[PDB]
Amino acid sequence: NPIHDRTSDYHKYLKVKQGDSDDKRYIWYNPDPKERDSYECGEIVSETSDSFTFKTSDGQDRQVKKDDANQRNPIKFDGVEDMSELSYLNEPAVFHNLRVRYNQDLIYTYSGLFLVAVNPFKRIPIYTQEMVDIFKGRRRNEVAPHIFAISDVAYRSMLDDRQNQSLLITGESGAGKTENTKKVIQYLASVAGRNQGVLEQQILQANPILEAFGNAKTTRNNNSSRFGKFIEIQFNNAGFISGASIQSYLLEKSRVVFQSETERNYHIFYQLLAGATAEEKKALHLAGPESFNYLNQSGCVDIKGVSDSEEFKITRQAMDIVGFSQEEQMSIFKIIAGILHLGNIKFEKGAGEGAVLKDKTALNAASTVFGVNPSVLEKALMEPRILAGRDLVAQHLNVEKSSSSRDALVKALYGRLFLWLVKKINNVLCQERKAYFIGVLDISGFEIFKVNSFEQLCINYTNEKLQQFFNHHMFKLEQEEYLKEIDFGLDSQATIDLIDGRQPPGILALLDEQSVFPNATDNTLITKLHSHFSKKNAKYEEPRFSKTEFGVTHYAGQVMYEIQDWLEKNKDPLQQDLELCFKDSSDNVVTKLFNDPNIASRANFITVAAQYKEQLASLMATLETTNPHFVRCIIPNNKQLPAKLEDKVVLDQLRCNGVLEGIRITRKGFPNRIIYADFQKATDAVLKHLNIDPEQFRFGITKIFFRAGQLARIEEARE
Ligand SMILES: Nc1ncnc2c1ncn2[C@@H]1O[C@H](COP(=O)(O)OP(=O)(O)O)[C@@H](O)[C@H]1O
Ligand SMILES: [Mg+2]
């Protein structure tokens, strides 16, 4: 028994070591108030009903107020598995426990409802079959923190409550959302699939494929997910996997035509370029990424510790497993290839405010591979017909404009293709006969970058709703766990409203209004916003100086956004003639992408914001029907290094994500101040022996709710 077997890897890697043997007061102080996050521990030389006085590291005293005191929990608490047990809940205290664990390579910790996960940035052998095996049917409290644990508890709850389940895994980029997501899947595939089982493999083989097309190297992660996802794992009434469905969100289509220095475009481009046969290449009029605009710009065409070649095998291999037809494949690759050619096209001004395509090279390559007609692509690109009254005139675009349309084309295609891959995969995996499901959400948390644009507002709106769901969930519990004699998600409402309100109209509604609109510009747009909200809506901020930015007070703080391009982004335009050109494609796949309203169109067309709000609401509607579980993935630093947990990087995250918030209530909100077993009837004996004060202690029903007080003096007592 590994749980019992202290030699087991289980014990080693998942537990704080058991050294079986069977008067002071510290604080976390900051030797630099300018460094709110760089504490030190100091001893309290004494108190005063009003304050505390300790001893700096230097051993040269200072003195704060009790009510300002970041008291250090007793050392015995150092490494506890759930922050719900700490006496002292305060930032540094919290950090300190995470740290102590992280230092022992214990990346998982609970904080009440939350599973906190700190990326280790190195391999930790804990996702082995043996490891799976150990987690089966065990309660959270019976085994070490782990993503398998949460996964198991959701699976049991599902079988026991006959209720759908959900797992919400969020956090910043490179924090390990995706890692944890796969493990959830893996564990589920193991504990509930076929042993002595094809659907499972298929279900598994779907992630590699989506990753090839939707992930990429960024400066924060070598395999960034450039789309959000919701994985519905489907079970029959017996508790075995019947199927699966994937919902994707906000693919970063722009990355196809532009990548920052050092980053890469999507994986697949490289894999394709480096994995194709000497024969498909030329067949594909292919060449090296060096020779490709969309791949020659960032200075990076490689990922260290990565073989595009080998990875291409997989993708392919996976394609076969799921079921893509060889031709479907080729076609899928033709698109990629196609896309590459288009990036190669070069518009020059050949006479006067008009682009000319002097070199028909790249054009031919694109077309040929797209199975479209060189002549109309061209005309669709450089001279699209534009409706101007009754009039449908062909319009000659300059060079700039011509390129952007070309880019718009590249993006729809990429975007469209992804859309298709997802459906096609669903076709193969999906079951609406399902009894139940366990859904896993893998998407970024709040995002505050150097520059925040329309995409960040969306992500942050979602986060705003996810956090209110958490808060509400959390009050339900309390409320219900009180069948006897403070709604928290009400607090997220104003922000939510500012963004999505209808009347008065919020940011999105104003944006939509402007997108139809005649006098349509980024400047009219930003003016309307301040006009409606500056000094008028408490969650809004008009900048002292920028004329192109605005601030929203989000849950996790203010985020300044920039409006450049919102109108275009909201409309996501694509020249219809261009729609026309492709509509008539030789390719069977290309045709779908342009002929299938379900693919080639948004839902009388709605805008991007409108589509986003909707898919957000649908998502939430779904969640509301589940028993949710919460996973907060934490990045330990910004260097992609193990062993380096920087205070500041960490505390920021615990404030944004709501572990910290969620916690502080965990002071008042003292359920988990239930030491059913403690140092029941003599459990007042003790209180009566040490004669502690009534109303710091609490008698539940054999259960409990003790005091985050004497409790933290009530342990290193000599008796
Ligand atoms: N449990 C884990 N063990 C090892 N590496 C991990 C773990 N979680 C994340 N990582 C590391 O971080 C990198 C990025 O993590 P990832 O799951 O992709 O984050 P996210 O999806 O949150 O952007 C991984 O590819 C890996 O190197
Ligand atoms: Mg990811």
Curated annotation (Swiss-Prot):
Domain Myosin motor: from-to ranges: 78-719
Residues noted as binding ATP in the record, renumbered to the chain: 171-178
Residues of the full protein shown: 2 to 759 of 2116
Subcellular localization, as worded in the UniProt entry: Cytoplasm, Cell cortex
Domain description: Limited proteolysis of myosin heavy chain produces 1 light meromyosin (LMM) and 1 heavy meromyosin (HMM). HMM can be further cleaved into 2 globular subfragments (S1) and 1 rod-shaped subfragment (S2).
Membrane spanning stretches: none
Domain Myosin N-terminal SH3-like: 23-74
Chain residue ranges for the region called Actin-binding: 616-638, 698-712
Source domain of life: Eukaryota
Assembly, per entry: Myosin-2 heavy chain is two-headed. It self-assembles into filaments. Hexamer of 2 heavy chain subunits (MHC), 2 alkali light chain subunits (MLC) and 2 regulatory light chain subunits (MLC-2). Associates with elmoA.
Disulfide bonds: none
UniProt function note: Myosin is a protein that binds to actin and has ATPase activity that is activated by actin.
Note: Dictyostelium myosin-2 has no K(2)EDTA ATPase activity, perhaps correlated with the absence of a Cys at the SH-1 position (688).
Residues the record lists as N6,N6-dimethyllysine modifications: 122
Gene symbol of the encoding locus: mhcA
Organism whose genome encodes this protein: Dictyostelium discoideum
Family: Belongs to the TRAFAC class myosin-kinesin ATPase superfamily. Myosin family.
Processing and modification events after translation: Phosphorylation inhibits thick filament formation and reduces the actin-activated ATPase activity.
Protein name as it appears in the record: Myosin-2 heavy chain
